Design a protein around this motif. Sequence first.
Motif, PDB file in Angstrom:
ATOM      1  N   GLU A 113       0.777  -1.208  -0.018  1.00 27.39           N
ATOM      2  CA  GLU A 113      -0.020  -0.054   0.011  1.00 27.39           C
ATOM      3  C   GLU A 113       0.867   1.277   0.117  1.00 27.39           C
ATOM      4  O   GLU A 113       0.510   2.385  -0.821  1.00 27.39           O
ATOM      5  CB  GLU A 113      -1.043  -0.046   1.117  1.00 27.39           C
ATOM      6  N   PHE A 116       2.929   1.029  -3.837  1.00 30.56           N
ATOM      7  CA  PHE A 116       2.110   1.200  -5.093  1.00 30.56           C
ATOM      8  C   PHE A 116       1.012   2.066  -4.745  1.00 30.56           C
ATOM      9  O   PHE A 116       0.192   2.281  -5.771  1.00 30.56           O
ATOM     10  CB  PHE A 116       1.759  -0.253  -5.472  1.00 30.56           C
ATOM     11  N   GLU A 117       0.888   2.404  -3.545  1.00 33.17           N
ATOM     12  CA  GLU A 117      -0.393   3.303  -3.258  1.00 33.17           C
ATOM     13  C   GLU A 117      -1.509   2.755  -3.763  1.00 33.17           C
ATOM     14  O   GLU A 117      -2.630   3.288  -3.906  1.00 33.17           O
ATOM     15  CB  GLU A 117      -0.372   4.524  -3.917  1.00 33.17           C
ATOM     16  N   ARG A 119      -2.374   0.643  -5.901  1.00 29.23           N
ATOM     17  CA  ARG A 119      -2.635   0.079  -7.045  1.00 29.23           C
ATOM     18  C   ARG A 119      -2.428  -1.289  -7.182  1.00 29.23           C
ATOM     19  O   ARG A 119      -3.045  -2.018  -8.187  1.00 29.23           O
ATOM     20  CB  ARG A 119      -1.422   0.764  -8.266  1.00 29.23           C
ATOM     21  N   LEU A 120      -1.644  -2.051  -6.557  1.00 26.83           N
ATOM     22  CA  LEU A 120      -1.517  -3.325  -6.471  1.00 26.83           C
ATOM     23  C   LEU A 120      -2.052  -3.968  -5.193  1.00 26.83           C
ATOM     24  O   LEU A 120      -2.156  -3.217  -4.373  1.00 26.83           O
ATOM     25  CB  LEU A 120      -0.289  -3.983  -6.738  1.00 26.83           C
ATOM     26  N   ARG A 134      -0.519  -4.246 -15.611  1.00 27.82           N
ATOM     27  CA  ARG A 134      -0.872  -3.386 -14.340  1.00 27.82           C
ATOM     28  C   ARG A 134       0.262  -3.210 -13.543  1.00 27.82           C
ATOM     29  O   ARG A 134       0.808  -2.378 -12.856  1.00 27.82           O
ATOM     30  CB  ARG A 134      -2.015  -4.406 -13.315  1.00 27.82           C
ATOM     31  N   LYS A 137       2.785  -0.811 -15.073  1.00 24.21           N
ATOM     32  CA  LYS A 137       2.156   0.527 -14.978  1.00 24.21           C
ATOM     33  C   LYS A 137       2.344   1.129 -13.454  1.00 24.21           C
ATOM     34  O   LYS A 137       2.866   2.389 -13.218  1.00 24.21           O
ATOM     35  CB  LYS A 137       0.599   0.595 -15.107  1.00 24.21           C
ATOM     36  N   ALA A 138       1.971   0.299 -12.438  1.00 23.29           N
ATOM     37  CA  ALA A 138       2.139   0.680 -11.343  1.00 23.29           C
ATOM     38  C   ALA A 138       3.711   0.726 -10.731  1.00 23.29           C
ATOM     39  O   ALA A 138       4.008   1.605 -10.056  1.00 23.29           O
ATOM     40  CB  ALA A 138       1.806  -0.597 -10.242  1.00 23.29           C
ATOM     41  N   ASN A 141       4.729   4.233 -13.488  1.00 21.40           N
ATOM     42  CA  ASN A 141       3.897   5.400 -13.295  1.00 21.40           C
ATOM     43  C   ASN A 141       3.472   5.972 -14.979  1.00 21.40           C
ATOM     44  O   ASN A 141       2.305   6.651 -15.084  1.00 21.40           O
ATOM     45  CB  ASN A 141       4.703   6.579 -12.550  1.00 21.40           C
ATOM     46  N   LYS A 143       1.461   5.905 -18.323  1.00 19.12           N
ATOM     47  CA  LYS A 143       0.456   5.094 -18.704  1.00 19.12           C
ATOM     48  C   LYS A 143       0.679   4.464 -19.829  1.00 19.12           C
ATOM     49  O   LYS A 143       1.321   4.803 -20.925  1.00 19.12           O
ATOM     50  CB  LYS A 143      -0.844   6.442 -19.012  1.00 19.12           C
TER      51      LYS A 143
END
Length: 173
Positions: A113, A116-117, A119-120, A134, A137-138, A141, A143
């Motif tokens: 957490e 990857f905030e 994201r995963l 995914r 990307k995580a 950053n 896109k």
Amino acid sequence: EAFAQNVLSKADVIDAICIFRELQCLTPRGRYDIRIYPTFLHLHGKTFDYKIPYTTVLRLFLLPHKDQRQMFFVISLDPPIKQGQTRYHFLILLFSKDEDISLTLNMNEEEVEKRFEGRLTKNMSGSLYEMVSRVMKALVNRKITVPGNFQGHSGAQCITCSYKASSGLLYPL
DNA sequence: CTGTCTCGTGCCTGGTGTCTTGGGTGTTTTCCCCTTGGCGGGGGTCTG
């Protein structure tokens, strides 16, 4: 497993975030495992190995195949990985839509957490190409570019055309 | 009962793909070379 247990019984083991084993690569060619690290990715092969820092990545492209059965995952590199007398400007991977996977990270929930905030997650499951997209990307950053509003006459998202004495697919991003 | 076609592995090997090298060929890259960039006394001649 017996050898591993015998080794662990005497050693004091204390890593990669996730390890994808055997992924169809087109440039370079062959099967290669991919180990993820916080600041780079290790492309391990049966002979040759490479290490691409995330700082060298420029763009991530996820494209479908003309027949609508496969997915191209392209990574634009900078500088290009060198191999003797050749330099690769793009890392191309080929996946199948029916190729699922279930991955578990080598981290804890709170650490994921924080990194990857959210994201995963600690455990994931889904299509292989979706998982790779995914994760990348995580990590980067940037896109992931996807096909635009183009649709060929054959319903595909590309055009089959030749180039430098070689057939291939052209995608209008 | 029953056995022939099919799915699903192991195994391995041979066939796919591509670095690497050599030749042909157009193009820049330097050096060299050629064209260029104050005073007076006379004389005669023309116009009115």
